[PDB]
Amino acid sequence: MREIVHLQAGQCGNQIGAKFWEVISDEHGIDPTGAYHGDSDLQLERINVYYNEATGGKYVPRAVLVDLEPGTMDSVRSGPFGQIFRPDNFVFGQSGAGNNWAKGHYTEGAELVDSVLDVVRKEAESCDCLQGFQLTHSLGGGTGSGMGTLLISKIREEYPDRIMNTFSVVPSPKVSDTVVEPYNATLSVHQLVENTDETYCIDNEALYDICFRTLKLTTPTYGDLNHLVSATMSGVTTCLRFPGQLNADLRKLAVNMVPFPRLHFFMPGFAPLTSRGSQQYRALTVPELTQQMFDAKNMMAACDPRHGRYLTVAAIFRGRMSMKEVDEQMLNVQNKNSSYFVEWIPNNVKTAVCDIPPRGLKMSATFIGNSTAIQELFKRISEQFTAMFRRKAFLHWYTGEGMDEMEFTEAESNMNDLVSEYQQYQ
Amino acid sequence: MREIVHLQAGQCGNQIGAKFWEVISDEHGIDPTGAYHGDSDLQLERINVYYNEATGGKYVPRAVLVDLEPGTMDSVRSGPFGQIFRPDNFVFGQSGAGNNWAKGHYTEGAELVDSVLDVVRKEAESCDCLQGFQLTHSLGGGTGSGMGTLLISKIREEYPDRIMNTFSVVPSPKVSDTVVEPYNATLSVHQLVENTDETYCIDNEALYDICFRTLKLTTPTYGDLNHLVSATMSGVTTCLRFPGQLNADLRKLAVNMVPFPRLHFFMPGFAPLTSRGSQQYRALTVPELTQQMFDAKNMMAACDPRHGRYLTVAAIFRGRMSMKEVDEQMLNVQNKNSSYFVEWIPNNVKTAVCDIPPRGLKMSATFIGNSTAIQELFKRISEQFTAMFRRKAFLHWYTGEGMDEMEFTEAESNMNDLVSEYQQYQ
Amino acid sequence: MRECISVHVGQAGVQIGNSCWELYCLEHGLQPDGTMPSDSSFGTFFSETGSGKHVPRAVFVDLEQTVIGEIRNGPYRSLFHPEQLITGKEDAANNYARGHYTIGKELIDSVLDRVRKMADQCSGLQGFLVFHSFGGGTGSGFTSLLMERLSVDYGKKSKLEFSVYPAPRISTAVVEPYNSILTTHTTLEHSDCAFMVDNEAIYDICNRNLDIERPSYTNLNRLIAQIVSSITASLRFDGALNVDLTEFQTNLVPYPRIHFPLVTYSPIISAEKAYHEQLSVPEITNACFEYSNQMVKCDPRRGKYMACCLLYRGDVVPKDVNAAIAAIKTRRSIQFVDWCPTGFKVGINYQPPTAVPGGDVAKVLRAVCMLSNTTAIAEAWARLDHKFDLMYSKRAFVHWYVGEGMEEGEFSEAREDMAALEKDYEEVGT
Amino acid sequence: MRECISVHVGQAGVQIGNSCWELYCLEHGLQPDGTMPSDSSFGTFFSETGSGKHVPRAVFVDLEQTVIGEIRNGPYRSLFHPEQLITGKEDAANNYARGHYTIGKELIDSVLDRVRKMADQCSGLQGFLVFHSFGGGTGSGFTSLLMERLSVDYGKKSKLEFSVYPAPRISTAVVEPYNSILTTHTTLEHSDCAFMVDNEAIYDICNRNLDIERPSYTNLNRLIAQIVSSITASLRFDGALNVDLTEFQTNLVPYPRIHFPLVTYSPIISAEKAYHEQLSVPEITNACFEYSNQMVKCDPRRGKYMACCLLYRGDVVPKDVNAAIAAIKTRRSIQFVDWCPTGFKVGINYQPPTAVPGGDVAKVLRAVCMLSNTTAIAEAWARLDHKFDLMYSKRAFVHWYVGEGMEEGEFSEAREDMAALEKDYEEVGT
Ligand SMILES: CC(=O)O[C@H]1C(=O)[C@@]2(C)[C@H]([C@H](OC(=O)c3ccccc3)[C@]3(O)C[C@H](OC(=O)[C@H](O)[C@@H](NC(=O)c4ccccc4)c4ccccc4)C(C)=C1C3(C)C)[C@]1(OC(C)=O)CO[C@@H]1C[C@@H]2O
Ligand SMILES: CC(=O)O[C@H]1C(=O)[C@@]2(C)[C@H]([C@H](OC(=O)c3ccccc3)[C@]3(O)C[C@H](OC(=O)[C@H](O)[C@@H](NC(=O)c4ccccc4)c4ccccc4)C(C)=C1C3(C)C)[C@]1(OC(C)=O)CO[C@@H]1C[C@@H]2O
Ligand SMILES: Nc1nc2c(ncn2[C@@H]2O[C@H](COP(=O)(O)OP(=O)(O)OP(=O)(O)O)[C@@H](O)[C@H]2O)c(=O)[nH]1
Ligand SMILES: Nc1nc2c(ncn2[C@@H]2O[C@H](COP(=O)(O)OP(=O)(O)OP(=O)(O)O)[C@@H](O)[C@H]2O)c(=O)[nH]1
Ligand SMILES: Nc1nc2c(ncn2[C@@H]2O[C@H](COP(=O)(O)OP(=O)(O)O)[C@@H](O)[C@H]2O)c(=O)[nH]1
Ligand SMILES: Nc1nc2c(ncn2[C@@H]2O[C@H](COP(=O)(O)OP(=O)(O)O)[C@@H](O)[C@H]2O)c(=O)[nH]1
Ligand SMILES: [Mg+2]
């Protein structure tokens, strides 16, 4: 019944993934041992969406864990929930990607993908009706960017009609840890624009802006960033895991969210987010969830939506709430902000409403933006790429893996073609 | 339902503002935590006018707090009510305005206004029907005068039909703390005459005259001055927060108060004010509230109204009182004082009457004067400006920010044009 | 049969309505929840649903929420149908052009939809009773928007209109003369009988007859509702000489545009004096001809009477009324026009005036409402067009009206049309 | 004798069904386990098995499991036959072409097999009651697949169809205009009477009449079921003037393609007001002609009425109804066509409206459902084909429909066929 297969690539993809599995195990009431310990029948009704039943009523999550180094598998397996995953589903190399896309895609991960893909088959053949693939990765570095997009290509060729749905942490100039980040991302975005049905563009600069300007955390870690990402991952699948007044499958999102085939680079958000010391003073209700959700400080990519227009927004609400009040606020937003929505679509907002809010809050909303403002994320990567590439800097590490200079020229060409298609509807 | 967005600029604007939020939270029965603790349904009926509902029935005030220094945010956030405001709505720089208008308007605040204005959008988009903007600032110094009038210009261009309503503490010769006060004010008044729909002209000399010659305070602080200002701020919005025998919105004031577009420099007052040791001997009633309200010692600008004529006065009464008695006294005043009202308007007094008097008094009246006597406030600033400017004194601090000498000439030109339009109807 | 749709507009019309419906509920014995413990006398003002709930034939309209949200919360929250209490977001700001062109332009097609759903529940609808302020932005601009629609939608039906009009000295607004003069097209073209009332005249009646030294608006509205109960009493009750709502107009209105009667009520009296006065039919008839009891500050002796409707109610007999009007015809200070030799239309109804239990106005065996077409009312127009002239000579507030979609020439076209009405009332006295 | 097969399709149709079957069980006194404690009144809606268990004549169909798995688990799990609650694996994704061509193509021959096993238990089946969303992928595409089959398999039998239709402003999907326009062939060719309903109109009815400030879908579905109880009441109960399901159509439908009536119900009322309103037959008749009570956001005054079915139920008498429709014929704002001089079909049934005990809608002695063929409904089509035109000028989402086996030309062929229906409703008003 609409099973998902989930795949984790590199350090970032395994870290946002290993936090996601702690979040949806809390929702479904699954113990770190894999045993069920929840309150409610609704937690158990759709446990098959993310888990396999095994003997003694132990639940085993349908993750595949992929890396070119053992050290992230060792960090996940030893972690808060590490014992939950199937030992056979940890698929790994020994020598890493070197932060090189071409090691991921052509050498170190091209060896390993035959050992990954045949595990993706065992999980997809155990499904009753697979709806799709949910892949967590980063576009900087070499494992997530280059092996993860190799793996997207292989699963896309094998499962052409299932939803391919990716959560993609990607570079920005003011929060960076790699010299060759622009190269790896430009080579990787070239695969995402052709193969994925949805890609949720996420940024460490925007995830730090939520931690300082909303949550007021003094020292936000990667563990705090991974918690913001995984809340929106739990959010968008909610309507195939729980009952609701308006149900929306990942495909019911895609049909409404993607006007023209390639414009599927979304930008997620979440509400309510409150400063930890301030919760008692806030009224949780649909118009406050709306005034947070649609504000430029809440979105998890550096793009200010005031630099573009939305094509479509989806607001996937959770909790006991009025359909008049939801339909009123999703009208009031796009009429009072009409200069920020495209005027050749007569209603830009999709709504969905689940009856079951996250554990410990009365309501919640996961936001998905599609906006021409995502041109700014692809533009700044393309101009960092260009300034290195005009002087061929660092290319011997990629051409040493047998990659052509022509593949860089063709990747940055396809990047400007993606920038041009969003700028066309501005 | 007729939401207001409130904005605080510089030290003075954040201090009269942070006292105003203590006054209207006492009225609406809101705790320093943001929780509601009031007596009455009428306190809750219009709480949306100044607050957002948030989870747990906590109320969050719709203030934006703006400064170029952290130290006033630190003083507000640590203060009597500091924990009430949204952490995201404190928008601030690090290096101050130097008491320089051109730092506010062109350099230090021109950097920051992009971070202010996008918060004013989140609050205005959360409104059901915004009626206007209520901005607290000073015309001396550089943050309130130069950044606050930059921000008025930006919000005026974005919201052209909403009420722009400003409370403006401004210079006078006998109570002064700045050498360049005349410059900053003359550059700032040039923005207020074009953009605002109402500006309430307030003076520290007149606020000290109320403290010594009425209240008989031995040592009045800025905290005592801020309490007089914020009583008249609560006063003029009363008729959209509480029921009444005659309701007057801020727009119903403006249509009656502003005969010709630019003559909107008002002069506020409040009654009853009594010496603290004398209250038991006074009869609180409409003709005593009138004999205080219309007397030259009560108004909060240095202008004696006996040096001009009123165009319009608005008396916004609060409490259980007779409409015959109000209409009798507002007639008796302008017939017995007919030499002090313009004789081409057949009735110079607007009245309004709210059913709910301030907590702890049986009645109250907020007075708004429009009078040709406000020429004296603009004249004495213009002559202090002139005596420095004839010798170009201090101009390297402003022209160092890339400002022209021509902008000083054009500001003082527009100041004498405002003096001439009030003196024309004398 | 014999229905009336009552439309209450702006703060003044809604607050007069909150006194009208306070009275009609007592007079018909309807609880404030719309139920009736224990004849079709209520049918003029109330639709009856099968639960035994009587729902008023009223629409309440305001462009801002505050006054109708109080009606939706006070003792009458259960009386009215929730969608015939109609509100906007935005106040009309004492600006005619916001009421007529900009803000009321949005609520009008919802106001009409309620009036249609009320008229479709009538069977021989008698007319409309429209309550408003002449000085208000919603009062002038929204009533003038609504009346223009009702005068094409319901062209045959009589439109009776109760107006709180600006005083000689008492005023609440600077722009009250502008809103009133802009309204004069509404009353001339889209009304059939327009009852001007003045706050300052009722304040003086309260001081001299009720002996209340300092009245509120609740004291005024309790007099203004009492007149409409007495205009409608012949529609609602048995009488010796019942008067139809068009029979009234056929005797009040001598010429198509001469439909601005004065109104007065007697006895206005407190419980301190009602037990010592006789309150005979002769005295309460004569009280209606005193300048002291006219509810507009103008002197009837500076005019001539065209026609009087003496609408008596309670314990009176046609003997007494004829003997009374014979003394009024004898008094040379009460002067009729040469062309109205009959002068008086008499109505007599068997239902006494109902006391509101909280009120100042005392229990009495008799009342009369006198509604009176007289040339004197042109002075209340000559006062206000002299207030208009001082301000329009400067264009003193005109940018607020021009800024909200009005033509500047409408001020000249309204002062012009008022001068043609003030001409007509001087022309027929001769 | 007098059976109806009720088919509930997609989330909207199933959730309206979960309110329909909540009502029918109360109204016939059937427990939620299908048993009946202590006349054949239930026979229209329930088959009876020898255990004394009443099983509904209903099919529930959804292409995804979630909503019907909730029906299979909630209080009605024991009411329905387990194989007439029908589910697929895969959601239709708000895509007409998944419902019609790709996913619903698999479940259809199982849906028909249940409808055959229900029809073979009928003896003089009266018709079908088909419940759906116009905006859904299952709602539009699966209903249009099913109706094409039922219109060859059961060609004589009347197909009544209850549709939740897109609003002027309220919408839940970007592609709601595409799914609705593609449905217009279904209603034109394979339906006999199609009741359009609007979420935004019921939300406003809830606000103004029930005084609920913020309603859910449970509040809407409890109004939509109440209308179908009133359409079927003459099939189920004794009355003074019972109406057959084809007698209804012979008076509603003037021309073969002109079978899109409005529907309305009165009184919609809360327990706060039902004890103060009269709710006389005159008032609840007049309430049906107010724009305020129409369940599609269009104004009947911008149209002409072709025919009205006034279906009264509860304590009413033909005297009162004739006296009521005589006032409706008197009102010049309610305009019929020149070619329908009779105008009104009256039904009267002795069974009052059943309250759902958890509901907002109050106990009342009387109700009327007015079902009304009027030219005004063409504006609800003119709204939505202007939403379609903006998106089809860009081909804005067309690759999702072309990608799932639809011809691209069907969008032009559907906008064309809608323009011919919007032509027909303008053509007959003259
Ligand atoms: C008493 C009270 O109000 O507790 C709240 C709380 O104070 C606040 C501040 C919580 C708290 O969130 C954080 O501290 C936080 C820190 C970094 C990054 C993200 C969150 C909370 O920890 C988070 C926690 O939320 C959950 O448990 C959700 O179900 C969430 N899952 C987890 O956070 C989780 C934690 C550990 C293990 C497994 C899951 C979730 C979100 C989306 C989808 C599914 C589940 C809640 C309600 C609270 C606390 C406990 C203080 C907030 O988070 C959520 C998701 O509600 C932060 O802003 C909201 C507003 C809440 O009021
Ligand atoms: C027993 C008694 O009569 O107490 C009075 C009192 O003695 C007098 C002197 C009060 C007092 O005012 C002052 O001491 C004062 C000092 C400096 C500047 C301004 C005021 C009073 O403190 C002030 C206080 O007023 C209020 O509380 C109002 O609601 C006011 N709000 C506040 O002052 C306030 C204080 C703390 C926290 C939050 C609000 C207000 C005014 C306008 C609009 C809304 C609210 C009142 C009645 C009194 C005391 C307590 C002695 C007076 O003030 C007011 C606003 O009434 C000063 O002249 C009046 C006359 C009063 O009689
Ligand atoms: N008698 C009486 N007069 C009232 C009452 N309320 C207001 N008035 C009169 O109303 C006149 C002004 O009109 P407004 O009250 O401002 O009318 P409005 O329609 O609410 O105007 P807007 O606020 O602009 O929409 C004044 O002259 C008042 O004296 C009331 O309850 N009784
Ligand atoms: N009144 C009411 N309207 C509903 C309800 N459920 C859904 N709707 C309406 O359904 C319309 C959209 O159709 P869907 O709910 O997506 O129909 P669906 O058949 O389930 O569509 P698919 O998921 O694609 O199969 C919206 O306009 C909703 O307002 C309900 O229970 N009551
Ligand atoms: N949110 C998040 N970002 C991470 C985490 N670890 C690394 N990143 C960041 O995103 C990039 C991820 O690249 P990485 O995963 O190291 O490359 P790979 O291992 O070769 O795929 C790094 O440069 C970091 O800036 C993590 O745990 N969470
Ligand atoms: N009423 C009042 N006046 C103040 C306060 N603080 C400063 N002022 C006075 O008004 C002027 C305000 O300027 P300031 O706010 O310091 O300039 P800015 O910070 O650059 O905007 C000062 O020169 C003081 O005379 C205060 O708390 N209340
Ligand atoms: Mg008003």
Ligand SMILES: [Mg+2]
């Ligand atoms: Mg569906």
